[PDB]
Amino acid sequence: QSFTGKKRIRKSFGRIPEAVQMPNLIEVQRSSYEQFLQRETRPGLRRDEGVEAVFKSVFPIKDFNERAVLEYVSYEFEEPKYDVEECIQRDMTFAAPLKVKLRLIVFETEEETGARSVKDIKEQDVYMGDIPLMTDKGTFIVNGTERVIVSQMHRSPGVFFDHDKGKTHASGKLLFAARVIPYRGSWLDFEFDAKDIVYVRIDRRRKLPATTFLYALGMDGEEILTTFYDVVPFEKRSGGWATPYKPERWRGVKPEFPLVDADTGEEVAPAGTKITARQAKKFADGGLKTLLTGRYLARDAEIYAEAGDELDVTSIQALADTVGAYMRNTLRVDKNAIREDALFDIYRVMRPGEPPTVEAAEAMFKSLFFDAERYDLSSVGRVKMNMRLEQDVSDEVRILRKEDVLAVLKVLVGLRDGRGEIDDIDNLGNRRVRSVGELLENQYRVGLLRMERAIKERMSSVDIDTVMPHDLINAKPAAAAVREFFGSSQLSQFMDQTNPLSEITHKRRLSALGPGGLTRERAGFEVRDVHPTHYGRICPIETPEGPNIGLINSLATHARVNKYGFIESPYRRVKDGKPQDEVVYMSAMEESKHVIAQSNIKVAEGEIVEDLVPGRINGEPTLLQKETVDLMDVSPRQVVSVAAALIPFLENDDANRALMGSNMQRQAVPLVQSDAPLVGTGMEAVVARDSGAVVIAKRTGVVEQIDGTRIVIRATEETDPARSGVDIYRMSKFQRSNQSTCINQRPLVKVGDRIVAGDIIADGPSTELGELALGRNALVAFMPWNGYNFEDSILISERIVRDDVFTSIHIEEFEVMARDTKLGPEEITRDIPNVGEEALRNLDEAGIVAIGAEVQPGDILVGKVTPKGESPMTPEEKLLRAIFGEKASDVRDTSLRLPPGVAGTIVDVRVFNRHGVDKDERALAIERAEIDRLGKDRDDEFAILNRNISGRLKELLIGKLAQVASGLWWQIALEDEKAMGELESLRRLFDENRKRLDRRFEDKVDKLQRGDELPPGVMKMVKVFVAVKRKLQPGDKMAGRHGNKGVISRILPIEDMPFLADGTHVDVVLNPLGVPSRMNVGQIFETHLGWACANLGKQITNLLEDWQQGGQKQALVERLTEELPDTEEGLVELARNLGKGVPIATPVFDGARMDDIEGHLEMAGVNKSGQSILFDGLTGEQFKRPVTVGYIYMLKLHHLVDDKIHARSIGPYSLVTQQPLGGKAQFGGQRFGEMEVWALEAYGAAYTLQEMLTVKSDDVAGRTKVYESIVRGDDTFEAGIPESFNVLVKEMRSLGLNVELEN
Amino acid sequence: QAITRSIADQARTIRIPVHMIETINKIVRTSRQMLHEIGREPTPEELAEKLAMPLEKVR
């Protein structure tokens, strides 16, 4: 509706979802880094979480040998030296330098004095390093092909009680391993065994008793059982049975002793329940019973008592003047009764080789757990512990307190037999999600600890008095940590940027693998499941199908990450009956106590009138009444993610097949002319507006002009005097995405159309009218057409390839180097000798391909002339050279060439010359054209700025014959001074803005002329950007919108396709067998809705062609579409977009039911059966059955046939094994594996196996022989010893083995 | 002296000479001090004159 739906009005189908607006999709990583990098003034730097906290915790250090402190005042964040648009091309680190304040003091002097001559601080400052400031779209550009950091889901810090499921048990008993997982430190395990004893299995190394751990803390021995036992009201020998005991625990126990009352009696021999005996004892002023022996007497008891509780007596020496049995058993099994022995045992467990010492062992345990420097348990860990086991306020303390271990042991021994449920280790709230913010904070803390160690080692040598500021602080490990985090980290491994949805789903991707979490193998079948608390916070359908399933599940559309780390999904809070509007993001930990009722419930005008609303009180869904309901779901799509929210009729799809469709929504290339789906989802507009590569109007003013490359916008309807002026949006042209695909933007706004702030001005890759459009809607017939779609393959019409509707660009952008080799500097001149003139075409004098010249597969791209030594002089080659008179070229051909493909044209050829000698004799015209275009765009920006400035000045002066004097823009030419002064101030501010722009442009041109950033070896690097125009050739993995994937079948002409009743031929002919097998019947419902929308569009466009803007057309649009009536004259433009089918925004779970689709088909002139008569195209006959012919939203998934095809008879071979390389990188060969060699082994094809893995690949002396034989004509070969067996016997011979052939 | 004499040999996998190891250490120390005091990373041609050595040798 905000200039994005007015021309693409989507008839919504949700009942009434307006609980809470969904947050920004990229807001997860944005808000994460915005607590890791404040980037504001001093009062805004107060952040207990982020880089500031770790820095202030690691930066201040002391010197115990010289009394030198290194204080931290604050750090100042500077702007990035390179812009994102300029850093994407330079392929450098889009980072900003970190400036931190230093203060070294020597006040603490000797002679019992606290102030020295240099006691005053110096206020130093050191260049910490450059950190990759998060882009506005959340990309984290470290180099070319920007990689976004996926969030990680590691085990949240805190105590855990993983009750064993019988595995590793004696016979069938449980273990109840109480393990506290610290945020940064050593793990602790308090598991049990078959002997019913608690063992502190520290970090799963040894199984020493917990009594040693208690002795290490100091609270063990005669004081550890105080909270476990107590004194009994027993007496001594006297008349009868005298004892001042109170009966309070004798119920449900047989009367082993006659504990009858004193006067009358009680405690009968039955002892059934003691319901009356307890009441009588309580009402009789105490349960005075007149009565064991073999009990536990380990209570507090040195003159008459002794250590240990083992009497086996009848209380000799005047007695020394079934719920809990764990503590007494561990104290006896422990062989260490002294804290020193426990410390020695702990030291031997941790470091068995090192000899344990008295103070060394005590220091080891303290540094391990009692030290906050090593056992850095985050605040989230402490709060999680306080919630699991109740404790006092401990947010400040991080290390596990001595009282915390006691409470952990008590809760463990309580939960061993009931007394509260265990803490599931596979809970969403139990698994706190970490993002790029926390990950970078932890790795920067590690780097700062390394830098602190280096500074402590270096400060002992250099004195602090009269020392150069920041001379001992290093900067290598500071930036090295972030470089490794963005260079080869598992979390920063890649950024799926095939389309705006792939970026969002990749940014909102919680990967459970990587450093700090379980690897791909470590996952297992437990973490690869979906817990009930995952509902609303993490999508259960959108997940990779490969081995990493359940580990890289993306975050929900509404879910947010709290400050602690837990995922907080929104929940519309409701009172008794009446559901209020107050919403709160309830974390998964606090969601268990609260009862939740799902959305899509029939609520009345003021409350819910169902009284049997569905929902789940804690994970398990049940039928909760209207009352006793406090939390309600915000929207039905809260459970699905961004990539899954765009699946129309997703409630109809299968739980498994929707995972296939949700994964391909993010795996759809950006198509040219791609329009929004007719049966799309309302989430598409939000995902396209809250994604990257789409320019959003940051102002309210009206657009001035649009030329594709840029779009100028006025300031606003109410703009400040000199705040920002006009804001021009430089539209991103066809640049190679991270997936080697196109990223193009089109100025959807027209010249002279007012646009409010916050809306999408120009569409991004695969978008139309602001809405996300992964592909184009094509007429689909779900019928098996002549077997071309027998399997999941998808038949195709020529109209979907002839009209250029499913064609992308896929800019490869190959890279070439000119590194100075040891045998002379490598050259990039015109061409290498011994090359035909046909391949040298399309090359300028520099040697690179001309910008815009089509290059066939294998043609010369950049001539690389690499000097080397004299090649091996062969006699035949020397004779040939002497015969032809030529001379042997001393240089080897190394010019870059295009691999086998259909790339063709070249978009951009960027050259990065060395700073030393740049543009000397190569790439001069390239840099000249670059500076010419830069000056041209600068002049255009200056002209538009001057135009809008003159317009504003005229608007301001007209209110304060001006046409006869146009030169009075800077002078009033009258007696006025206040107005003239204000105009002069505004003009000087605008001139300062122009000067700042000119300064930025001159800095850019100076950086270009001085030499771009090049590696240390290569001096001239050419980055040729070749762009393809891949059509819909047979082989492209054109998958549907719901999960019905399939390779495109043979491209049938637009004549053989099945004819419709109106004469139109369907663009695709799918297979109906995919619906019954994989229950994705929503694809059929989605196709019916698309057919209804297409018929409505054909009816409206057929109604506008006869009468443009007719009085009756608005009536039909209102009947079909209420936010439709618009006072503007855009109705003539809205129908132009609706002619291709009126789009629909169907919710993920509140869309149109069967009755809604039926009514839509009736009102859209569609047959009520949903299908339609479809005449055959091949032969031509009315099919004797209703065929479904709708407008399905097909995609153009990146798994094409071009990027996946491969054929290499003989390519470059490896070195360790001399085998052909793998993959399509460099002429690879399909690896013939053990499981694929067994296919021929079981077969009689042993000659193939004697030539496929003997002479084909791993026979350097047999491969050439067989190739020469095949070229000669005879199909004979020979191969005795392959290179694989040779390297194997050489490796075995490397050891003490005697692998040696014989006879 | 023994660690610096041996670390300079059995650490690069190519047995870089001791004097070349000390030269590269001096170069990296100069680059670090320049990043700390002067500002951005200096060009490789500037490091040749910053240490009073041949320009081609530093390259």
UniProtKB/Swiss-Prot annotation, chain A:
The cross-references to InterPro entries, in alphabetical order and at most eight, read: DNA-dir_RNA_pol_bsu_ext_1_sf (IPR042107), DNA-dir_RNA_pol_bsu_external_1 (IPR019462), DNA-dir_RNA_pol_su2 (IPR015712), DNA-dir_RNAP_su2_dom (IPR007120), DNA-dir_RNAP_su2_hyb_sf (IPR037033), RNA_pol_bsu_bac (IPR010243), RNA_pol_bsu_CS (IPR007121), RNA_pol_bsu_protrusion (IPR007644)
Which Pfam families does the entry link to? RNA_pol_Rpb2_1, RNA_pol_Rpb2_2, RNA_pol_Rpb2_3, RNA_pol_Rpb2_45, RNA_pol_Rpb2_6, RNA_pol_Rpb2_7
| This protein's UniProt keywords | DNA-directed RNA polymerase, Nucleotidyltransferase, Transcription, Transferase
Fetch the Gene3D superfamilies from UniProt: 2.40.50.100, 2.40.50.150, 3.90.1100.10, DNA-directed RNA polymerase, beta subunit, external 1 domain, DNA-directed RNA polymerase, subunit 2, domain 6, RNA polymerase alpha subunit dimerisation domain, RNA polymerase Rpb2, domain 2
Which top-level enzyme class is recorded in the Swiss-Prot or TrEMBL entry?
transferase
Any GO BP annotation: DNA-templated transcription
Q: Which HAMAP family does this entry report, sorted A to Z?
A: RNApol_bact_RpoB
PANTHER family in the cross-refs: DNA-DIRECTED RNA POLYMERASE I SUBUNIT 2
**Protein name (database record):** DNA-directed RNA polymerase subunit beta
Q: Which gene encodes it?
A: rpoB
